PDB file of C-alpha atoms in Angstrom:
ATOM      1  CA  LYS F   4       0.000   0.000   0.000  1.00  0.00           C
ATOM      2  CA  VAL F   5       0.892   3.673   0.354  1.00  0.00           C
ATOM      3  CA  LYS F   6       2.028   5.573   3.466  1.00  0.00           C
ATOM      4  CA  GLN F   7      -0.386   7.479   5.703  1.00  0.00           C
ATOM      5  CA  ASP F   8       2.049  10.005   7.192  1.00  0.00           C
ATOM      6  CA  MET F   9       0.718  13.519   7.333  1.00  0.00           C
ATOM      7  CA  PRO F  10       2.290  16.177   5.120  1.00  0.00           C
ATOM      8  CA  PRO F  11      -0.150  17.478   2.506  1.00  0.00           C
ATOM      9  CA  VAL F  12       0.480  19.405  -0.687  1.00  0.00           C
ATOM     10  CA  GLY F  13       3.095  21.902   0.296  1.00  0.00           C
ATOM     11  CA  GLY F  14       2.894  25.090   2.282  1.00  0.00           C
ATOM     12  CA  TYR F  15      -0.486  25.119   4.075  1.00  0.00           C
ATOM     13  CA  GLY F  16      -0.827  28.590   2.575  1.00  0.00           C
ATOM     14  CA  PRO F  17       0.934  31.582   4.112  1.00  0.00           C
ATOM     15  CA  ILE F  18       0.962  32.533   7.780  1.00  0.00           C
ATOM     16  CA  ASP F  19       1.448  35.959   9.369  1.00  0.00           C
ATOM     17  CA  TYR F  20       3.670  36.138  12.449  1.00  0.00           C
ATOM     18  CA  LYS F  21       4.669  39.794  12.514  1.00  0.00           C
ATOM     19  CA  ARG F  22       3.298  42.348  14.955  1.00  0.00           C
ATOM     20  CA  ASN F  23       0.456  44.696  14.007  1.00  0.00           C
ATOM     21  CA  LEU F  24      -0.849  47.491  16.226  1.00  0.00           C
ATOM     22  CA  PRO F  25      -2.182  50.288  13.998  1.00  0.00           C
ATOM     23  CA  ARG F  26      -4.783  52.858  13.142  1.00  0.00           C
ATOM     24  CA  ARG F  27      -5.310  55.690  15.637  1.00  0.00           C
ATOM     25  CA  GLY F  28      -5.401  58.826  13.503  1.00  0.00           C
ATOM     26  CA  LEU F  29      -7.684  61.107  15.501  1.00  0.00           C
ATOM     27  CA  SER F  30      -4.698  62.165  17.584  1.00  0.00           C
ATOM     28  CA  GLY F  31      -2.849  65.259  16.653  1.00  0.00           C
ATOM     29  CA  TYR F  32      -3.104  68.022  19.145  1.00  0.00           C
ATOM     30  CA  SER F  33      -6.553  68.150  17.549  1.00  0.00           C
ATOM     31  CA  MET F  34      -7.826  65.906  20.327  1.00  0.00           C
ATOM     32  CA  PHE F  35      -7.236  68.910  22.546  1.00  0.00           C
ATOM     33  CA  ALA F  36      -8.991  70.924  19.868  1.00  0.00           C
ATOM     34  CA  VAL F  37     -12.193  68.917  20.133  1.00  0.00           C
ATOM     35  CA  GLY F  38     -12.145  68.668  23.927  1.00  0.00           C
ATOM     36  CA  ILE F  39     -11.336  72.322  24.527  1.00  0.00           C
ATOM     37  CA  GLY F  40     -14.000  72.936  21.911  1.00  0.00           C
ATOM     38  CA  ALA F  41     -16.506  71.071  24.061  1.00  0.00           C
ATOM     39  CA  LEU F  42     -15.553  73.299  26.986  1.00  0.00           C
ATOM     40  CA  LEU F  43     -16.050  76.352  24.768  1.00  0.00           C
ATOM     41  CA  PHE F  44     -19.589  75.084  24.177  1.00  0.00           C
ATOM     42  CA  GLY F  45     -20.291  74.361  27.830  1.00  0.00           C
ATOM     43  CA  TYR F  46     -19.350  77.805  29.056  1.00  0.00           C
ATOM     44  CA  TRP F  47     -21.496  79.408  26.358  1.00  0.00           C
ATOM     45  CA  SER F  48     -24.677  77.489  27.151  1.00  0.00           C
ATOM     46  CA  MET F  49     -24.146  77.517  30.913  1.00  0.00           C
ATOM     47  CA  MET F  50     -23.533  81.264  30.752  1.00  0.00           C
ATOM     48  CA  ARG F  51     -26.923  81.704  29.123  1.00  0.00           C
ATOM     49  CA  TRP F  52     -28.729  79.509  31.625  1.00  0.00           C
ATOM     50  CA  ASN F  53     -27.210  81.275  34.627  1.00  0.00           C
ATOM     51  CA  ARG F  54     -28.272  84.633  33.207  1.00  0.00           C
ATOM     52  CA  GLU F  55     -31.821  83.301  32.878  1.00  0.00           C
ATOM     53  CA  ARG F  56     -31.742  81.975  36.419  1.00  0.00           C
ATOM     54  CA  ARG F  57     -30.688  85.409  37.680  1.00  0.00           C
ATOM     55  CA  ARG F  58     -33.621  86.934  35.822  1.00  0.00           C
ATOM     56  CA  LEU F  59     -35.856  84.476  37.666  1.00  0.00           C
ATOM     57  CA  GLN F  60     -34.090  85.379  40.914  1.00  0.00           C
ATOM     58  CA  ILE F  61     -34.958  89.067  40.604  1.00  0.00           C
ATOM     59  CA  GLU F  62     -38.509  88.126  39.677  1.00  0.00           C
ATOM     60  CA  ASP F  63     -38.890  86.009  42.833  1.00  0.00           C
ATOM     61  CA  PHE F  64     -37.450  88.685  45.108  1.00  0.00           C
ATOM     62  CA  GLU F  65     -39.999  90.947  43.457  1.00  0.00           C
ATOM     63  CA  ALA F  66     -42.732  88.581  44.581  1.00  0.00           C
ATOM     64  CA  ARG F  67     -41.472  88.762  48.165  1.00  0.00           C
ATOM     65  CA  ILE F  68     -40.900  92.506  48.292  1.00  0.00           C
ATOM     66  CA  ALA F  69     -44.342  93.158  46.854  1.00  0.00           C
ATOM     67  CA  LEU F  70     -45.655  90.920  49.633  1.00  0.00           C
ATOM     68  CA  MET F  71     -43.781  92.546  52.520  1.00  0.00           C
ATOM     69  CA  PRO F  72     -46.308  95.217  53.661  1.00  0.00           C
TER      70      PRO F  72
ATOM     71  CA  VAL O 104      20.846   9.527  26.583  1.00  0.00           C
ATOM     72  CA  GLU O 105      21.178   9.621  22.802  1.00  0.00           C
ATOM     73  CA  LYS O 106      24.370  11.685  22.956  1.00  0.00           C
ATOM     74  CA  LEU O 107      25.978   9.417  25.516  1.00  0.00           C
ATOM     75  CA  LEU O 108      24.596   6.292  23.849  1.00  0.00           C
ATOM     76  CA  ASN O 109      25.798   7.053  20.274  1.00  0.00           C
ATOM     77  CA  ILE O 110      22.485   7.144  18.437  1.00  0.00           C
ATOM     78  CA  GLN O 111      20.756   9.501  16.102  1.00  0.00           C
ATOM     79  CA  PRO O 112      16.972   9.729  15.857  1.00  0.00           C
ATOM     80  CA  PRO O 113      15.453   9.519  12.381  1.00  0.00           C
ATOM     81  CA  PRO O 114      14.748  12.897  10.770  1.00  0.00           C
ATOM     82  CA  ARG O 115      10.971  12.888  11.227  1.00  0.00           C
ATOM     83  CA  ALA O 116      11.485  12.273  14.934  1.00  0.00           C
ATOM     84  CA  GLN O 117      13.763  15.299  15.119  1.00  0.00           C
ATOM     85  CA  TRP O 118      11.202  17.445  13.305  1.00  0.00           C
ATOM     86  CA  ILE O 119       8.290  16.406  15.520  1.00  0.00           C
ATOM     87  CA  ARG O 120      10.515  17.009  18.535  1.00  0.00           C
ATOM     88  CA  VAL O 121      11.281  20.531  17.303  1.00  0.00           C
ATOM     89  CA  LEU O 122       7.608  21.222  16.614  1.00  0.00           C
ATOM     90  CA  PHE O 123       6.398  20.306  20.079  1.00  0.00           C
ATOM     91  CA  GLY O 124       9.509  21.952  21.479  1.00  0.00           C
ATOM     92  CA  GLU O 125       8.509  25.373  20.219  1.00  0.00           C
ATOM     93  CA  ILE O 126       4.843  24.673  20.967  1.00  0.00           C
ATOM     94  CA  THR O 127       5.839  23.974  24.557  1.00  0.00           C
ATOM     95  CA  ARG O 128       7.870  27.187  24.499  1.00  0.00           C
ATOM     96  CA  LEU O 129       4.706  28.985  23.448  1.00  0.00           C
ATOM     97  CA  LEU O 130       3.045  27.443  26.501  1.00  0.00           C
ATOM     98  CA  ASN O 131       5.635  28.392  29.096  1.00  0.00           C
ATOM     99  CA  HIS O 132       5.941  31.909  27.699  1.00  0.00           C
ATOM    100  CA  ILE O 133       2.199  32.577  27.585  1.00  0.00           C
ATOM    101  CA  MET O 134       1.953  31.272  31.141  1.00  0.00           C
ATOM    102  CA  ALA O 135       4.871  33.314  32.458  1.00  0.00           C
ATOM    103  CA  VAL O 136       3.490  36.515  30.933  1.00  0.00           C
ATOM    104  CA  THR O 137      -0.139  36.009  31.926  1.00  0.00           C
ATOM    105  CA  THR O 138       0.534  34.828  35.477  1.00  0.00           C
ATOM    106  CA  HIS O 139       2.962  37.723  35.752  1.00  0.00           C
ATOM    107  CA  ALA O 140      -0.025  39.943  35.004  1.00  0.00           C
ATOM    108  CA  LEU O 141      -2.452  38.202  37.371  1.00  0.00           C
ATOM    109  CA  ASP O 142       0.086  38.448  40.177  1.00  0.00           C
ATOM    110  CA  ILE O 143       0.463  42.176  39.618  1.00  0.00           C
ATOM    111  CA  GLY O 144      -3.164  43.026  38.911  1.00  0.00           C
ATOM    112  CA  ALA O 145      -5.032  42.660  35.667  1.00  0.00           C
ATOM    113  CA  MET O 146      -7.371  39.789  36.333  1.00  0.00           C
ATOM    114  CA  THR O 147      -8.453  39.175  32.692  1.00  0.00           C
ATOM    115  CA  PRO O 148      -5.492  38.391  30.340  1.00  0.00           C
ATOM    116  CA  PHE O 149      -4.886  35.221  32.338  1.00  0.00           C
ATOM    117  CA  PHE O 150      -8.343  34.177  31.183  1.00  0.00           C
ATOM    118  CA  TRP O 151      -8.188  35.233  27.539  1.00  0.00           C
ATOM    119  CA  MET O 152      -4.912  33.474  26.878  1.00  0.00           C
ATOM    120  CA  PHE O 153      -5.254  30.376  29.044  1.00  0.00           C
ATOM    121  CA  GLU O 154      -8.272  29.590  26.914  1.00  0.00           C
ATOM    122  CA  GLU O 155      -5.843  29.159  24.005  1.00  0.00           C
ATOM    123  CA  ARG O 156      -3.540  27.240  26.324  1.00  0.00           C
ATOM    124  CA  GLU O 157      -6.436  24.849  26.831  1.00  0.00           C
ATOM    125  CA  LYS O 158      -6.416  24.439  23.059  1.00  0.00           C
ATOM    126  CA  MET O 159      -2.727  23.541  23.358  1.00  0.00           C
ATOM    127  CA  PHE O 160      -3.429  20.753  25.818  1.00  0.00           C
ATOM    128  CA  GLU O 161      -6.202  19.755  23.431  1.00  0.00           C
ATOM    129  CA  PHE O 162      -3.289  19.060  21.085  1.00  0.00           C
ATOM    130  CA  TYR O 163      -1.236  17.104  23.623  1.00  0.00           C
ATOM    131  CA  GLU O 164      -4.210  14.887  24.450  1.00  0.00           C
ATOM    132  CA  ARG O 165      -4.352  13.718  20.850  1.00  0.00           C
ATOM    133  CA  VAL O 166      -0.578  13.425  20.548  1.00  0.00           C
ATOM    134  CA  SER O 167       0.566  11.511  23.621  1.00  0.00           C
ATOM    135  CA  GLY O 168      -2.781  10.214  24.829  1.00  0.00           C
ATOM    136  CA  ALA O 169      -2.870  12.301  27.997  1.00  0.00           C
ATOM    137  CA  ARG O 170      -3.143  15.917  29.012  1.00  0.00           C
ATOM    138  CA  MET O 171       0.093  17.277  30.481  1.00  0.00           C
ATOM    139  CA  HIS O 172       2.808  14.999  31.869  1.00  0.00           C
ATOM    140  CA  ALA O 173       2.486  12.311  29.184  1.00  0.00           C
ATOM    141  CA  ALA O 174       6.025  11.652  27.991  1.00  0.00           C
ATOM    142  CA  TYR O 175       5.802  11.101  24.220  1.00  0.00           C
ATOM    143  CA  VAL O 176       9.603  11.356  24.206  1.00  0.00           C
ATOM    144  CA  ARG O 177      12.170   8.584  24.480  1.00  0.00           C
ATOM    145  CA  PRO O 178      15.837   8.100  23.830  1.00  0.00           C
ATOM    146  CA  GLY O 179      16.427   7.198  20.232  1.00  0.00           C
ATOM    147  CA  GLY O 180      13.497   9.271  19.072  1.00  0.00           C
ATOM    148  CA  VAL O 181       9.839   9.795  19.892  1.00  0.00           C
ATOM    149  CA  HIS O 182       7.274   7.004  19.577  1.00  0.00           C
ATOM    150  CA  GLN O 183       3.611   6.889  18.552  1.00  0.00           C
ATOM    151  CA  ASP O 184       3.554   9.433  15.766  1.00  0.00           C
ATOM    152  CA  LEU O 185       0.789  11.999  15.345  1.00  0.00           C
ATOM    153  CA  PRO O 186      -2.793  10.801  14.829  1.00  0.00           C
ATOM    154  CA  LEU O 187      -4.063  11.250  11.312  1.00  0.00           C
ATOM    155  CA  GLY O 188      -5.484  14.746  11.029  1.00  0.00           C
ATOM    156  CA  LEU O 189      -3.464  16.402  13.795  1.00  0.00           C
ATOM    157  CA  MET O 190      -1.321  18.767  11.734  1.00  0.00           C
ATOM    158  CA  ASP O 191      -4.509  20.313  10.368  1.00  0.00           C
ATOM    159  CA  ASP O 192      -5.514  21.349  13.888  1.00  0.00           C
ATOM    160  CA  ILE O 193      -1.963  22.519  14.596  1.00  0.00           C
ATOM    161  CA  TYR O 194      -2.092  24.687  11.486  1.00  0.00           C
ATOM    162  CA  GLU O 195      -5.491  26.085  12.439  1.00  0.00           C
ATOM    163  CA  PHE O 196      -4.395  27.209  15.897  1.00  0.00           C
ATOM    164  CA  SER O 197      -1.123  28.609  14.569  1.00  0.00           C
ATOM    165  CA  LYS O 198      -3.153  30.578  12.021  1.00  0.00           C
ATOM    166  CA  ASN O 199      -4.824  33.130  14.294  1.00  0.00           C
ATOM    167  CA  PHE O 200      -2.670  32.809  17.403  1.00  0.00           C
ATOM    168  CA  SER O 201      -0.907  35.869  15.965  1.00  0.00           C
ATOM    169  CA  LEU O 202      -4.125  37.875  16.119  1.00  0.00           C
ATOM    170  CA  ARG O 203      -4.750  36.840  19.703  1.00  0.00           C
ATOM    171  CA  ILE O 204      -1.252  37.560  21.022  1.00  0.00           C
ATOM    172  CA  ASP O 205      -1.474  40.946  19.326  1.00  0.00           C
ATOM    173  CA  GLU O 206      -4.723  41.405  21.243  1.00  0.00           C
TER     174      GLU O 206
END
């Protein structure tokens, strides 16, 4: 008969050993640019809302002071 | 024993011996690294990689007929060559082990 030992048609195809750890492109300083940007949004909006809340504050004190007598 | 006994193993024995030599080296290295993590902190990598190690012992169990300590090595060459269809599994593990170690 023939022999049943293993090796097949040669090569088993290619195999990739070498190291790969790629792909993060979002990082220049521009990460700072987007974060600091987010701050620049927060202070804008929050500024507005605190102004509004002061307006309400004066209005409430007006309620009280009109009550006082 | 071979060296002192003036014998050479046949080539295929030497090749199998090399194969499982570097496989075993893959074992002891992956252990050393992972357990070095678990000791220090880092509960998880122990788990991720010792899964693959379990695949390795899945190889040994076919090869030598037992899990870990089974000899499968003698003087004058190894005995009980690979079961038919083993090198396929070896290939398949070796295929993506690269991906996982990079992980």
